[PDB]
From Swiss-Prot, chain B:
Protein name as it appears in the record: ATP-dependent 6-phosphofructokinase subunit alpha
Family statement drawn from the similarity comment of this UniProt entry: Belongs to the phosphofructokinase type A (PFKA) family. ATP-dependent PFK group I subfamily. Eukaryotic two domain clade 'E' sub-subfamily.
Residues involved in beta-D-fructose 6-phosphate 1 binding: S12, I13, D14, M56, G57, R58, E113, H146, V147, Q148
Top-level division of the source organism's lineage: Eukaryota
Protein's job: Catalyzes the phosphorylation of D-fructose 6-phosphate to fructose 1,6-bisphosphate by ATP, the first committing step of glycolysis.
Location in or out of the cell: Cytoplasm
Subunit description: Heterododecamer of 4 alpha, 4 beta and 4 gamma chains.
Residues of the whole record sequence present: 348 to 495 of 989
Coiled coil: none
Active site location: D14
Positions contributing to beta-D-fructose 6-phosphate 2 binding: R49, R140
From Swiss-Prot, chain C:
Name of the molecule in the record: ATP-dependent 6-phosphofructokinase subunit beta
Subunit-level organization: Heterododecamer of 4 alpha, 4 beta and 4 gamma chains.
Superkingdom to which the source organism belongs: Eukaryota
Coiled-coil boundaries: none
Complete-protein stretch covered: 348 to 397 of 941
Residues noted as binding beta-D-fructose 6-phosphate 2 in the record, renumbered to the chain: M27, G28, R29
Binding locations of ATP 2: I47
Organism: Komagataella pastoris (Yeast)
Family label: Belongs to the phosphofructokinase type A (PFKA) family. ATP-dependent PFK group I subfamily. Eukaryotic two domain clade 'E' sub-subfamily.
Binding site for beta-D-fructose 6-phosphate 1: R20
Function: Catalyzes the phosphorylation of D-fructose 6-phosphate to fructose 1,6-bisphosphate by ATP, the first committing step of glycolysis.
Subcellular location(s) of the protein: Cytoplasm
C-alpha cells in the first residue's frame, strides 16, 4: 500500500501501526456496561439450563 | 530594510537543537509515545510476550531515551550510543532474558527513527522483532508514525 | 479496540500539507468491522478490508 502511494502518487507516506495498543487499556463504557450484563446473563443462562 | 531583524524559535519534536534544554513540541511528542505504550502496559501480563515501539525523531535520541525512562523499557536504540554490528542481537537477548528471569513479563524495546549500529547500518523494528521472536517471545511492533 | 484506532487517526488528523499520505495498520484478522467503522468515524479516503 505504501509503495503505491509513494510511487504511483507523489505522496510522502508515514505508516502508523497500533499493534498491542488495540487490546490494551481499560474497557470503554459500552464494553464495561455490556460485558458486565453479559456476565450476569451467562450465570442465569447456565442455571436456567436443562 | 538594510539590516535584517531575524529571530528563531525551535519548533521540533526531535529535541536535536543545541543551546536549548528543550524544543517546542518535544515533550508533547513524548506524551503521545507514552499515551500508546501505556495501553500496551495496561493489560494483565502474559507468559511469553514482547513489544517493540518504533518512535519518531530523525536526528536525536532524546525521545527514545526519555520514553525508555518514562516506560521502563528493557532496551533502547539511540544514534548517540549505537551497539556493535557484531553482537547487538546477542546483547538484546541477554538484557531481556535477565529482566524476564527477575520477574518481568512485559518486555518492551524502543527503536528510534534514526536507530543504527556502530557501523552506521540502520536498525529496523522488524530486525528487533525477529531477535525477540527467536528468544521465544510473541513480539508486536507499534509504529507511532504521524501520531507523534 | 475501535476507540484505540480512532484515537490514533484523530491525532493524525490534528496537524497541517501537500504530498502527504497516512497509513493506519489495523489489527483484526478475520473481519473488516474495525476497518469499516474506523473509516466511517474518521472519514478515511480508502479502506482495505
Amino acid at each position: 500500500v505504501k509503495d503505491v502511494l509513494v510511487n504511483r502518487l507523489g505522496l510522502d507516506t508515514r505508516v502508523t501501526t497500533l499493534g498491542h495498543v488495540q487490546r490494551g487499556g481499560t474497557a470503554v463504557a459500552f464494553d464495561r456496561i455490556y460485558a458486565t450484563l453479559q456476565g450476569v446473563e451467562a450465570v442465569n443462562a447456565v442455571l436456567e439450563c436443562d | 530594510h538594510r539590516n535584517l531583524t531575524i529571530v528563531g524559535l525551535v519548533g521540533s519534536i526531535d529535541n536535536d537543537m543545541c543551546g536549548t534544554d528543550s524544543t517546542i513540541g518535544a515533550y508533547s511528542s513524548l506524551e503521545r509515545i507514552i499515551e500508546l505504550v501505556d495501553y500496551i502496559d495496561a493489560t494483565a501480563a502474559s507468559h511469553s510476550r514482547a513489544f517493540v515501539v518504533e518512535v519518531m525523531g530523525r536526528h536525536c535520541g532524546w525521545l527514545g531515551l526519555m520514553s525508555g525512562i518514562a516506560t521502563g523499557a528493557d532496551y533502547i536504540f539511540i544514534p548517540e550510543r549505537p551497539p556493535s554490528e557484531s553482537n547487538w542481537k546477542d546483547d538484546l537477548k541477554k538484557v531481556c532474558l535477565r529482566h524476564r528471569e527477575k520477574g518481568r513479563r512485559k518486555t518492551t524495546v524502543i527503536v528510534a527513527e534514526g536507530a543504527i549500529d556502530d557501523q552506521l547500518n540502520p536498525i529496523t523494528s522488524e530486525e528487533v522483532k525477529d531477535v525477540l521472536v527467536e528468544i521465544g517471545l510473541d513480539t508486536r511492533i507499534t509504529r507511532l508514525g504521524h501520531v507523534q | 479496540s475501535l476507540d484505540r484506532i480512532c484515537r490514533a487517526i484523530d491525532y493524525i488528523d490534528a496537524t497541517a500539507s501537500h504530498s502527504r499520505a497516512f497509513i493506519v495498520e489495523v489489527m483484526g484478522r478475520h473481519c473488516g468491522w474495525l476497518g469499516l467503522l474506523a473509516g466511517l468515524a474518521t472519514s478515511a479516503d480508502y479502506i482495505l478490508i
